[PDB]
């Protein structure tokens, strides 16, 4: 298992514009296109991302290319974040993948309110962190996904994904 496979499970793969769990125009492997309610705005953003007139549809290769860029960016985002970097660097490889999944899903900003959990992870208090992470809107809105990521931080194994 690895970060790509993990996310491919959590996000799925769709070749036509769709609305995510929050109702936002997305395509591919969880690539958010826009928070705007306009499908045209979404199609424009898609064309700009692909570099061609897609008409709202892409190929598997193009989806994977967006995915590669998005994963790279998430990691790069963590490393540039003074609050996140130190925690991430303290983690083992499996748990790093759980951290990337969360940023990928919610952005650096989305995980801004996770101070207490960050500290707990930094201190390697796994069960406690697991409990703290569950007290979140994230968990209440996407519970099956949150449970998988949480078990991952709790155990440091890929058990939730097998
Ligand atoms: C925001 C916490 C809970 C998870 C996380 C840890 C370290 C870097 C990025 C994410
Ligand atoms: Cl892009
Ligand atoms: Cl879910």
UniProtKB/Swiss-Prot annotation:
<comment type="similarity">
    <text>Belongs to the glycosyl hydrolase 24 family.</text>
</comment>
<keyword id="KW-0578">Host cell lysis by virus</keyword>
<dbReference type="InterPro" id="IPR023346">
    <property type="entry name" value="Lysozyme-like_dom_sf"/>
</dbReference>
<dbReference type="GO" id="GO:0044659">
    <property type="term" value="P:viral release from host cell by cytolysis"/>
</dbReference>
<protein>
    <recommendedName>
        <fullName>Endolysin</fullName>
        <ecNumber>3.2.1.17</ecNumber>
    </recommendedName>
</protein>
<dbReference type="Pfam" id="PF00959">
    <property type="entry name" value="Phage_lysozyme"/>
</dbReference>
<keyword id="KW-0929">Antimicrobial</keyword>
<dbReference type="InterPro" id="IPR052619">
    <property type="entry name" value="Phage_lysozyme-like"/>
</dbReference>
<keyword id="KW-0326">Glycosidase</keyword>
<feature type="binding site">
    <location>
        <position position="117"/>
    </location>
    <ligand>
        <name>substrate</name>
    </ligand>
</feature>
<dbReference type="GO" id="GO:0016998">
    <property type="term" value="P:cell wall macromolecule catabolic process"/>
</dbReference>
<dbReference type="GO" id="GO:0003796">
    <property type="term" value="F:lysozyme activity"/>
</dbReference>
<comment type="function">
    <text>Endolysin with lysozyme activity that degrades host peptidoglycans and participates with the holin and spanin proteins in the sequential events which lead to the programmed host cell lysis releasing the mature viral particles. Once the holin has permeabilized the host cell membrane, the endolysin can reach the periplasm and break down the peptidoglycan layer.</text>
</comment>
<dbReference type="GO" id="GO:0030430">
    <property type="term" value="C:host cell cytoplasm"/>
</dbReference>
<dbReference type="InterPro" id="IPR034690">
    <property type="entry name" value="Endolysin_T4_type"/>
</dbReference>
<dbReference type="InterPro" id="IPR001165">
    <property type="entry name" value="T4-type_lysozyme"/>
</dbReference>
<feature type="binding site">
    <location>
        <position position="32"/>
    </location>
    <ligand>
        <name>substrate</name>
    </ligand>
</feature>
<dbReference type="GO" id="GO:0042742">
    <property type="term" value="P:defense response to bacterium"/>
</dbReference>
<feature type="active site" description="Proton donor/acceptor">
    <location>
        <position position="11"/>
    </location>
</feature>
<keyword id="KW-0081">Bacteriolytic enzyme</keyword>
<feature type="binding site">
    <location>
        <position position="132"/>
    </location>
    <ligand>
        <name>substrate</name>
    </ligand>
</feature>
<feature type="binding site">
    <location>
        <position position="104"/>
    </location>
    <ligand>
        <name>substrate</name>
    </ligand>
</feature>
<keyword id="KW-0378">Hydrolase</keyword>
<dbReference type="InterPro" id="IPR002196">
    <property type="entry name" value="Glyco_hydro_24"/>
</dbReference>
<keyword id="KW-0204">Cytolysis</keyword>
<dbReference type="GO" id="GO:0009253">
    <property type="term" value="P:peptidoglycan catabolic process"/>
</dbReference>
<dbReference type="InterPro" id="IPR023347">
    <property type="entry name" value="Lysozyme_dom_sf"/>
</dbReference>
<keyword id="KW-1035">Host cytoplasm</keyword>
<feature type="active site" description="Proton donor/acceptor">
    <location>
        <position position="20"/>
    </location>
</feature>
<keyword id="KW-1188">Viral release from host cell</keyword>
